[PDB]
């Protein structure tokens, strides 16, 4: 509901880009003294078409209705006269995403399992609100402090109508295919269980400290090959249907890899829900903590 006046917004730096969104760091200082809050402002590029504009409206509408300790905090909106739409104002998390933080900070196993438990808590809340995230990846998991994680980026999020188990989307170039379950790839159907598959991929990213050489696109493309014409998604669907999976990260405990593999069941109903994962991850974190 809050309205931020463009008048008092001072750009500090960009945090994320590019086609078709941009996240920037601003100081919102109405007193003009410097005591003003630091905010992360997400803007829709003025060049964006109707499809991305109706989607952006949905992203703001969804984030506005969500309230959870593991979901990025919505602060309000700013009128972007130049766009012309709304700029999404949210809390700024200094440590950034796990994708940017982990390659530079060796975090212990216990802490990574805590982040994974918190991701499941935030996701179970999201699923109880009858929404699917559709872009669950380490790049979209923001770190508030060494012990606290927050899910962001609701750009692909959708409301799943009551009584329905899935939502159908179309063939898109920006689809994060390397984080997607086979039902999404082959039938274009996104179930609550499809987000669980993406969590298994996110859990794999965390256990690899988001190392680029071990990332899901890197590993799947080494399996698929780069001279496949328009067939990368087809070869991906085929390798997953044959039971091939991302490997066990170095130092990942066997039980944790088995949990990962269970999130990667080909049959969507054989996967645990986020509600089932919470006590499991609480127990595993407790085992590994010291």
The catalytic residue positions are 135
Locate 71 and state its tokens. 């979901």
Q: Is 15 flagged in the annotation as binding? A: yes
- Contact mark string toward ligand ADP, 178..197, x via CB under 6 A: --------------------
Q: How far apart are CA 193 and CA 181, in angstroms?
A: 9
Question: Residue 151 or 268: which CB sits closer to Mg ion?
Answer: 151
Q: What is each CA distance from 245 to 86, 230, 236, 250, 281, in whole angstroms?
A: 41, 22, 10, 15, 21
Q: Which stretch binds ligand ADP (CB under 6 A): 150-158, 222-230, 250-258, 270-278?
A: 150-158
Q: How far apart are CA 11 and CA 27, in angstroms?
A: 7
Greatest Cα-to-Cα distance within the chain, rounded to the nearest angstrom: 62
| One residue of 26, 73, 133, 153 binding Mg ion per CB under 5 A | 153
Pick from 104, 61, 76: nearest CA to 8 = 76
Contact between 55 and ligand ADP by CB under 6 A: the answer reads: no
| One residue of 118, 140, 194, 198 binding ligand ADP per CB under 6 A | 140
Q: Is 233 flagged in the annotation as binding? A: no
Contact between 60 and ligand ADP by CB under 6 A: the answer reads: no
Q: Could you tell me if 256 and 207 are in contact, meaning their C-beta atoms sit under 8 angstroms apart?
A: yes
Q: Which stretch binds ligand ADP (CB under 6 A): 44-52, 139-147, 187-195, 218-226?
A: 139-147
Give the β-pairing of 37-44 and 85-91. Answer: antiparallel
Residue 21, phi then psi, degrees to nearest 5: -115, 165
Contact between 41 and ligand ADP by CB under 6 A: the answer reads: no
H and E: helices and strands count for the chain: 9, 12
Question: Residue 44 or 113: which CB sits closer to Mg ion?
Answer: 44
Please list every residue from 61 through 120 that binds ligand ADP, using CB under 6 A: 72, 90-93, 96-97, 100
Cβ at position 88, least distance to ligand ADP in Å: 9
Pick from 15, 257, 53: nearest CA to 152 = 15
Q: Is 244 flagged in the annotation as binding? A: no
Rounded to a whole number, what is the distance in angstroms from the first to the last CA of the chain?
A: 43
Cβ at position 140, least distance to Mg ion in Å: 5
Question: Residue 153 or 183: which CB sits closer to Mg ion?
Answer: 153
Q: How far apart are CA 220 and CA 159, in angstroms?
A: 30
Cβ at position 71, least distance to ligand ADP in Å: 11
Cβ at position 163, least distance to ligand ADP in Å: 29
Contact between 40 and ligand ADP by CB under 6 A: the answer reads: yes
Q: Which stretch binds ligand ADP (CB under 6 A): 13-21, 76-84, 158-166, 181-189?
A: 13-21
Category of 240 on φ-ψ map: left (φ > 0), alpha (ψ -120 to 50) or beta: alpha
Q: How far is CA 69 from the centre of its chain?
A: 16
Contact between 155 and Mg ion by CB under 5 A: the answer reads: yes
Binding residues: 15-23, 42
Binding residues for ATP: 15-23, 42
Residues that bind Mg ion (CB under 5 A): 140, 153, 155
């Amino acid at each position: 509901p809050t309205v931020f006046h463009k008048r008092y917004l001072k750009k500090i730096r960009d945090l994320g880009e590019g086609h078709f969104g941009k996240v920037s760091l601003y100081c919102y200082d109405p007193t003009n003294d410097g005591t003003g809050e630091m905010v992360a402002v997400k803007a829709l590029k003025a060049d964006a078409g109707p499809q991305h504009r109706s989607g952006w409206k949905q992203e703001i509408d969804i984030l506005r209705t969500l309230y959870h300790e593991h979901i990025i905090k919505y602060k309000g909106c700013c009128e972007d006269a130049g766009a012309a739409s709304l700029q999404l104002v949210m809390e700024y998390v200094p440590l950034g995403s796990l994708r940017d933080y982990l390659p530079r900070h060796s975090i212990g196993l216990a802490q990574l399992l805590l982040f994974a438990q918190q991701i499941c808590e935030g996701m179970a809340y999201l699923h109880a609100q009858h929404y699917i995230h559709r872009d669950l990846a380490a790049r979209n998991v923001l770190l508030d402090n060494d012990r606290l994680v927050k899910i962001g980026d609701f750009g692909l999020a959708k409301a799943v109508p009551e009584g329905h188990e899935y939502y159908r989307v179309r063939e898109d170039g920006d689809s994060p295919v390397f984080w997607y379950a086979p039902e999404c790839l082959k039938e274009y159907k996104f179930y609550y269980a499809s987000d669980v598959w993406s969590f298994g991929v996110t859990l794999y990213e965390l256990l690899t400290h988001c190392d680029s050489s071990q990332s899901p696109p890197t590993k799947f493309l080494e399996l698929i090959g780069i001279a496949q014409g328009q067939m990368t998604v087809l070869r991906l669907t085929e390798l997953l249907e044959r039971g091939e999976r991302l490997p066990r990260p170095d130092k990942c405990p066997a039980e944790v890899y088995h949990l990962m593999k269970n999130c990667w069941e080909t049959e969507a109903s054989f996967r645990p829900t986020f509600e089932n994962l919470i006590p499991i991850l609480k127990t595993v974190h407790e085992k590994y903590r010291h």
